[PDB]
Structure formats: structure tokens, C-alpha cells
């Protein structure tokens, strides 16, 4: 029994090592410390300082250097007694300050303990190295175990959700968010792995599992923050029958980063699939596809990075091709997907030349003709449609000769649509396979980024941020109720931001954006002007910059984020020349024809991108609203992708943005420590005369100690089953003499 075998890997990897004694006495000391900022400028970097004295109003402590300082008791960040170092739930700490929180988190990480709870949340720190806690043997141990019974772990939250599902007959949700590279997908895959094991019986399970890899090849890429970043968000519905067995699955994708297909920053890569293809394609497939090295392609030859360390695109291509096979994609299907990938590479190879007049021309039909063949479309129609699209100018339909820039840009537009569309198609194709109309229950997993606050924030960041204001409010509401429940079981702000963004009347940012969208001739300037006009000095969550003329700022949950308006008009419309669609609709390819002839794929509805985003977010929320949710906050330890490197600033910032610290401060004001009578006595019986560790009237005994100690009744609160302590209370208690 691993949970009991102190020699087990379980103990080794998941628990703080346990000695031979329980004795309260070991932990005895007389020293008292505070967490202080040695450099007031750098407030997230703190040092421990012993309190050498005290006044009625302050504290006087000694620094590392032996430098004495004074602090207000109220501004003091007192350090919890050493015994608290490493607890599995921050909700267990007595002093709940920010430094204290990071500390516990750090003590744990120092021991390779990546999972820690914070009340309702499961905090997970990226180890940046392998930890063998995900083996089948690991899985088997979590089965049926209460949260309190076992150590913190993703498998643990997953078990709770499945048991709740079965016991409450209620659907469930796991929300996993955090920065790029923080480890979301990793945890996501574990949740599924675990579910499949605990509820599976396999063929479906297989196909389910195999879906991921497909999604990864097409929607994942190498960025500066992660070698395998998911450039899209997702919602995974794991379906079950009334018996508790997996019946199916459904996938919902969002915000795919199409842009990446025609452009990548230095060092980054295009989607993994491009490379897998280039590498593991048979030599006899290459020729059929007019393939070469990535170096030979405009879309792959520009970041100065075509491969990933510790990664074989060919080996991976095998992997992908297998999954497709398992899922059920016909060879013919597979072909076409590759052809598309191919065509896309060819399209980017097209060189627009425009010297003849002021309209572009094609001196070389090579690339062009390559695209056409693989697409199974006409080169002449493609050609025209690209540089001479007929545009409706009133009553007349006239073909316009496009310049070079415009020409290239349309070609790019074509490529992005191909991709985005193919992506949708795959998702669709997969759901068909695993998805159930008639399902009894479900467990859903949402994996997407948390707030994004980059150097430069564009339309996509507004969107993601918007989603996050909603998730945060959901958490907040959910937290409110359950807190009340518990306080009830025992005898014991985002609206404004959301409105500014999605409001109808008065119109919010998105409504103004849609409005400007109707006008062919509107510009970024008209748009940014309209926005300031309506909110500058008028809406409290908005800010007009002192000097930039292309940006505006939104005060979010996370804090202020400054956005830039470039291309928002275009992005909202996501325009594609009709001649283009025309061209592609006749496609000899059975896969191509769908992308264009299927209204479910080829069109949004009439609605704009923003309108579609709002809608999907609402359906999402709605659904979530019907489940019992679970929250996992994935934390990146540093920005270097290194182990044993947990940077306070890096960390603190995420804890502030993600709601963990907020949940704490809040709880901090209440009665944060809620202990079970038996457990209380066991550890502190010694504090009072006449109390045996094992006492049948735990509540009475509890009262004994408190009474003996002469604690202030305002500080503690008798619950039907637990004793509730205000902040600092347990600490001093702990700090008492045997
Ligand atoms: N528990 C873990 N054990 C080992 N490695 C991990 C763990 N969590 C994350 N990592 C590793 O760190 C890398 C980044 O993690 P992951 O891909 O899951 O992050 P992410 O949150 O999904 O990022 P993004 O938003 O860019 O897609 C991974 O390739 C992963 O292998
Ligand atoms: Mg990811």
C-alpha cells in the first residue's frame, strides 16, 4: 500500500518526506520572523528577517545583513511557523500574505512537489524536467480517493470530478489555464489519460487518445516560449453513459493562429505539420507533391529555424499518420490533407511581379501551377482570381487589376482560409467519429490561455482577455456560493470591464468595431477615434494614451492592458475575394470542395469575427454554467524553460493575475483555518492540562485548550464539526508551550 509504504515512489515523488516523529516538540523554537523586501523597489523579492523586538504598534527585525528595520504590525508580512512549510493546501496557512504563499509554494517545488492546492484551486508548477508520477501505477493509487486522502495531483482533481459525476449525477468541468509553456496541455493529457483508464473498457479510448496527436500536428508550433505550443484553445467533452463508462467525445476549437501560417518570428517555426510532411514524406510522395526542403519554401525558410532539438519530424509524421489511421481517415482523405498542406506551401512560393504597369503579373507559373494541381483547381482561374478579382462597384461587377502588395496579401488571405478551414474540417471529421448525440453525462476540459499581456496586444489578445474576464467572474461567483455553503453546513467587479467590451447599449468596443465594419472605406484611425470619443474620460475602465494615436487601454482583472488597433477592421471581416471561393468551389479534390462548399465550414453564419467570438463565448459559459467546475492554474516558474529555477517575480505576477492571491486575500478576511475537532486535539492536547490526544468529545477538548490558553473567542468559531480560526490564530497557538 503505496500510500502507506513510506518507501513507495508515491511517497518519494508526491509527499513531503516523513520522519519517525509526529511530536509537536521537534518544531519548537522561540524565534519569530517576517517576510521583508530588502529592496522596496523590487517588491516581489523578499527576505526573511527575524523580529528582534516589538513595540505596541510595530516590529523591529534584523535583516540578512544584520541591518535592523521597523515595520508596522499591520503592514507586516509575518512568516508562518516552520511546521507549515510544505502543507498541501495553502488554505492551511495561518498568515496568508503574498510572500508566505510563494514560500510554501517554493518549499514544495524545492522538493519537486509541483502540485499544491489553494482552497478551490489546484496550482501546478512546471517542473521543466521529467517526474515519474504519471504511470499506470500512479493512476491506480488515486482511484476513489478523496482529495484529503491523497496528495495533490491532477489525477486527484480528475478523480473527484468523476466521483461527483457519478454521485451527484451532475456534469462536470475542469478549467485549465495559464501562460504559454506553463503546462496546460500536459495536464490536459493526464486528465484524459486518467479518465480513460478509470472509466474505459480500447477502440474508442484509442481513437479518443489518438485525437490529440492529430490536433497537435496541425495546431501546434514552436515558439520562443514553448517548443510545442498550442496555437488554439479547446474544450474537450469526455462523454459517459449512466453506468460511468466513456461513451464518446466532442471537441471544440477556438482562436486558431492562422497568421502563423504565412509568417513566423525569428527562431519560431510554422505548424509542426509542414515539417513532418517535408521530412517523412515518401520520396515517392514528394515528387507527386512537388516537394523539397523547408529551405525551398517561403513559408518555412524565414525564421531561421526548421527543426526542434530532440525532435524527428519524420518520426512524428509517422505518429500523426498513424493516429489518422486509427481515427479513420481514409488514405484518400489523408492524401488530400497533405495535398492541401502542399498546395499551401506552393501558394506562398508565388512571386508577384509588377513592373509592366501598376498591376501585378506572373512571370513564373511554376509555383502557381503547383498549387493548382495539388488543389485540383484551374491555374488560369487561380491566377486571375488572385491578381484580377471582379469587385462589385455599385451595379457593375468589374475585375480589378491588383498591385503586388495587394496581390500577395490576397494570396495570403487564401492560404489562411485554407488552413483555418482545413483545421475546422479535421475537428469535424474527428467529432463525427467519437461524438455522441445520445450521451448521459460529461466531463469537460477547457484548455486555453489565461490573460495575455504582451509587448504588443492586438485583436486576438482582446478576445482571449475577454474570455478570461468571464472565467474569472465565473470563479468568483462559484467561490462565493461554495464558501456560503460551507459556512452554512456548520453552525458558523468584472461587469464594468465585460460591458466596456461587449456592451450593446451603450455600445462597447466590439459593438463599435462591428459598426465601422460595414464601411468599406473606414480605417484604423476612424476606428480608434470612435473608441476614444465614446470612452475617453467617459468610461472608468478605459484609457486614452497620452501620445500613442493607435492604442487604447483596458483595465482588466489582471490589470491594465494596452491594445493596438492595426488591422482590426480587416481582422473583423476576415475577407476573402469571392472569385477565390469561386475558384476553389469547383475543386476536383473531395476534401477541397468541402472547405468551400460547406456553409458550416466556409461561413460564419453575415456575422463578424467579433460577433462570432461573443456568441461562442456565451455558449461556452452557458454550458459551464450547468456543470460542477474544477479549476487548475498552470504556473511557468521562469522564462527560460529551465528546472530548479523558480523566480519570485515571474511567479508572483501569475498568482496575482490568475486569481489565486485574490482568492486568498478574500478568504484571509474570514475564517480561513477550519479544523476538525479530532485533528485539532491530537496535535494540541499537550497545550493543556487534562486533554488526551484521543478524546471522545473532541469539541469539548478543543474548547479545553482554547480555554486553557485563554484564546480570544472572537478569533475562533465553533462549527458543527470543525473549529474555524481567523488568520494568525492557529499560528500563535502553534507557537504555544507544551
Ligand atoms: N508535469 C510536467 N512534467 C514534465 N514536463 C512538463 C510538465 N508540465 C509541463 N512540462 C513540459 O513543459 C513544456 C510546456 O508545457 P505545455 O505544453 O503543457 O504548456 P502550455 O501551458 O500548454 O503552453 P502553450 O500555451 O504555449 O500551448 C512541455 O513540452 C512539457 O513537456
Ligand atoms: Mg498548450
Q: Residue 224: CB within 6 Å of ligand 1?
A: no
513 in contact with ligand 1, CB cutoff 6 A: no
Rounded-to-integer distance, Cα 398 and Cα 389, Å:
8
Mapped to the 3 state alphabet, what secondary structure does 480-504 carry? HHHHHHHHHHCCCCCHHHHHHHHCE
Experimentally, the structure was elucidated by X-ray
Q: Which three cell numbers stand for residue 77?
A: 508580512
230 lines ligand 1 (CB under 6 A): yes
Active site residue 229: yes
Where are the chain's structural domains? Answer: 32-79, 87-268+437-451+628-669, 269-328, 330-436+575-604, 456-574+606-627, 671-738
Q: What is the rounded distance in angstroms from the CA atom of residue 704 to the CA atom of residue 297?
A: 79
Q: Domain 269-328 falls in which CATH fold?
A: Arc Repressor Mutant, subunit A (1.10.10)
Alpha-carbon span 349 to 351, nearest angstrom: 6
Cα 183 to ligand 2 centre (Å): 7
Alpha-carbon distances of 585 from 104, 450, 592, 646, rounded to whole Å? 59, 38, 8, 53
Q: Which CATH number fits domain 32-79: 2.30.30.360, 1.10.10.10, 3.30.450.20, 3.30.470.20?
A: 2.30.30.360
Grid coordinates given for 642: 529551465
Based on the number of CB atoms within 10 Å of its own CB, is 95 exposed (0-12), middle (13-18) or buried (19 or more)? buried
Question: Which CATH topology does 330-436+575-604 take?
Answer: 1.20.120
- Please report, for the chain, how many H helices and E strands are present, in that order: 28, 21
- The verdict on whether 144 is a catalytic residue reads no
Backbone angles phi and psi of 59, in degrees to 5? -145, 145
Question: Are 121 and 663 within 8 A, CB to CB?
Answer: yes
- Find, among 296, 271, 293, the residue nearest to 367 by Cα: 296
- Indicate whether residue 182 lines ligand 1 (CB < 6 A): yes
**Cell numbers describing residue 28:** 519548537
Residue 8 designated active-site: no
Per the document, the length of the chain is 738
Residue with the smallest CA separation from ligand 1 atom 29 is 228
Among 229, 253, 572, 702, the one annotated catalytic: 229
Q: For residue 561, what is the enclosing H or E element?
A: strand 560-564
Q: Whose CA is nearest to atom 31 of ligand 1?
A: 186
Which residue shows C-alpha cell 467529432?
431
Pairing of strands 172-177, 441-447: parallel
Instruction: Find the DSSP H helices in 220-330.
Output: 272-280, 283-286, 313-327
Which residues are within 8 A (CB) of 369 and not within 5 positions of it... i.e. 6 or more apart?
Answer: 379
| Right CATH for 456-574+606-627 from 1.10.3720.10, 3.90.1150.10, 1.20.58.530, 3.30.450.20 | 1.20.58.530
Resolution in A: 2.2
CATH class of the region 87-268+437-451+628-669? alpha beta
422 three-class SS:
helix
Q: Of residues 47, 54, 452, 564, which has the active-site annotation?
A: 452
H or E, element range at 601: helix 599-602
In angstroms, how far apart are the furthest CA atoms of the chain?
103
Q: Put residue 710 in one of left, alpha, beta given phi > 0 → left and psi -120 to 50 → alpha.
A: left
Amino acid at each position: 500500500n503505496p500510500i502507506h509504504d513510506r518507501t513507495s515512489d508515491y511517497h518519494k515523488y508526491l509527499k513531503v518526506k516523513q520522519g519517525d516523529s509526529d511530536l509537536f516538540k521537534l518544531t519548537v523554537s522561540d524565534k519569530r520572523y517576517i517576510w521583508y523586501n530588502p529592496d522596496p523597489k523590487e517588491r516581489d523579492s523578499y527576505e526573511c528577517g527575524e523580529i528582534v523586538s516589538e513595540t505596541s504598534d510595530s516590529f523591529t527585525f534584523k535583516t540578512v545583513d544584520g541591518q535592523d528595520r521597523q515595520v508596522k504590525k499591520d503592514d507586516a508580512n509575518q512568516r508562518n511557523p516552520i511546521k507549515f512549510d510544505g502543507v498541501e493546501d495553502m488554505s492551511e496557512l495561518s498568515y496568508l500574505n503574498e510572500p508566505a504563499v510563494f514560500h510554501n509554494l517554493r518549499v514544495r517545488y524545492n522538493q519537486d512537489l509541483i502540485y499544491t492546492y489553494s482552497g478551490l484551486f489546484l496550482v501546478a508548477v512546471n517542473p521543466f524536467k521529467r517526474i515519474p508520477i504519471y504511470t499506470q501505477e500512479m493512476v491506480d493509487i488515486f482511484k476513489g480517493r478523496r482529495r484529503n486522502e491523497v496528495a495533490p495531483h491532477i489525477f486527484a482533481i480528475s478523480d473527484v470530478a468523476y466521483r461527483s459525476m457519478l454521485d451527484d449525477r451532475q456534469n462536470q468541468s475542469l478549467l485549465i489555464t495559464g501562460e504559454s509553456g506553463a503546462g496546460k496541455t500536459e495536464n490536459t493529457k493526464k486528465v484524459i489519460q486518467y479518465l480513460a483508464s478509470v472509466a474505459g473498457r480500447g477502440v474508442l479510448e484509442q481513437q479518443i487518445l489518438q485525437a490529440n496527436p492529430i490536433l497537435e500536428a496541425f495546431g501546434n508550433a514552436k515558439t520562443t516560449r514553448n517548443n510545442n505550443s498550442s496555437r488554439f484553445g479547446k474544450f474537450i467533452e469526455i462523454q459517459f453513459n449512466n453506468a460511468g463508462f466513456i461513451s464518446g467525445a466532442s471537441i471544440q476549437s477556438y482562436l486558431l493562429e492562422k497568421s502563423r501560417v504565412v509568417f513566423q518570428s525569428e527562431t519560431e517555426r510554422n505548424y509542426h505539420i509542414f515539417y513532418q510532411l517535408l521530412a517523412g514524406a515518401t520520396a515517392e510522395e514528394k515528387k507527386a507533391l512537388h516537394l523539397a526542403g523547408p529551405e525551398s519554401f517561403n513559408y518555412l525558410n524565414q525564421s531561421g529555424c526548421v527543426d526542434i532539438k530532440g525532435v524527428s519530424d519524420s518520426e512524428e509524421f509517422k505518429i500523426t499518420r498513424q493516429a489518422m489511421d486509427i481515427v479513420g481517415f481514409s488514405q484518400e482523405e489523408q492524401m488530400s490533407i497533405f495535398k492541401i498542406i502542399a498546395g499551401i506551401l506552393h501558394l506562398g512560393n508565388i512571386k508577384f511581379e509588377k513592373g509592366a504597369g501598376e498591376g501585378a503579373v506572373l512571370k513564373d507559373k511554376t509555383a502557381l501551377n503547383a498549387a493548382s494541381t495539388v488543389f485540383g483547381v484551374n491555374p488560369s482561374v487561380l491566377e486571375k482570381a488572385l491578381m484580377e478579382p471582379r469587385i462589385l462597384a455599385g451595379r457593375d461587377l468589374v475585375a480589378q487589376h491588383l498591385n503586388v502588395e495587394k496581390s500577395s496579401s490576397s494570396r495570403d488571405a487564401l492560404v489562411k482560409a485554407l488552413y483555418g478551414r482545413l483545421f475546422l474540417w479535421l475537428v469535424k471529421k474527428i467529432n463525427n467519429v467519437l461524438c455522441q448525440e445520445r450521451k448521459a453525462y460529461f466531463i469537460g476540459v477547457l484548455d486555453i490561455s489565461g490573460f495575455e499581456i504582451f509587448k504588443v496586444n492586438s485583436f486576438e489578445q482582446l478576445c482571449i482577455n475577454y474570455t478570461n474576464e468571464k472565467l474569472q467572474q465565473f470563479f468568483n461567483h462559484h467561490m462565493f456560493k461554495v464558501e456560503q455553503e460551507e459556512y452554512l453546513k456548520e453552525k458558523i467587479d468584472s461587469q464594468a470591464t465585460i460591458d466596456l467590451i461587449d456592451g450593446r447599449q451603450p455600445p462597447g468596443i466590439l459593438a463599435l468595431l462591428d459598426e465601422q465594419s460595414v464601411f468599406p472605406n473606414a480605417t484604423d484611425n476612424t476606428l480608434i477615434t470612435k473608441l476614444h470619443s465614446h470612452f475617453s474620460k467617459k468610461n472608468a475602465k478605459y484609457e486614452e494614451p497620452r501620445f500613442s494615436k493607435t492604442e487604447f487601454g483596458v483595465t482588466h482583472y489582471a490589470g491594465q492592458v494596452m491594445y493596438e488597433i492595426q488591422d482590426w477592421l480587416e481582422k473583423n471581416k476576415d475577407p476573402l475575394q469571392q472569385d477565390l471561393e469561386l475558384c476553389f468551389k469547383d475543386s476536383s479534390d473531395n476534401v477541397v470542395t468541402k472547405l468551400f462548399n460547406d456553409p458550416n465550414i466556409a461561413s460564419r453564419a453575415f456575422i463578424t469575427v467579433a460577433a462570432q467570438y461573443k456568441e461562442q463565448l456565451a455558449s461556452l459559459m452557458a454550458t459551464l454554467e450547468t456543470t460542477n467546475p474544477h479549476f487548475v492554474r498552470c504556473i511557468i516558474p521562469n522564462n527560460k524553460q529551465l528546472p530548479a529555477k523558480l523566480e519570485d517575480k515571474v511567479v508572483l505576477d501569475q498568482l496575482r493575475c490568475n486569481g489565486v492571491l485574490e482568492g486568498i486575500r478574500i478568504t484571509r478576511k474570514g475564517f480561513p483555518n477550519r479544523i476538525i475537532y479530532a485533528d485539532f486535539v491530537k496535535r494540541y492536547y499537550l497545550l493543556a492540562p487534562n486533554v488526551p490526544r484521543d478524546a471522545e468529545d473532541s469539541q469539548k477538548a478543543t474548547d479545553a485548550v482554547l480555554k486553557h490558553l485563554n484564546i480570544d473567542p472572537e478569533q475562533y468559531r465553533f462549527g458543527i464539526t470543525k473549529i474555524f480560526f481567523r488568520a494568525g490564530q492557529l499560528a500563535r497557538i502553534e507557537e504555544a508551550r507544551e
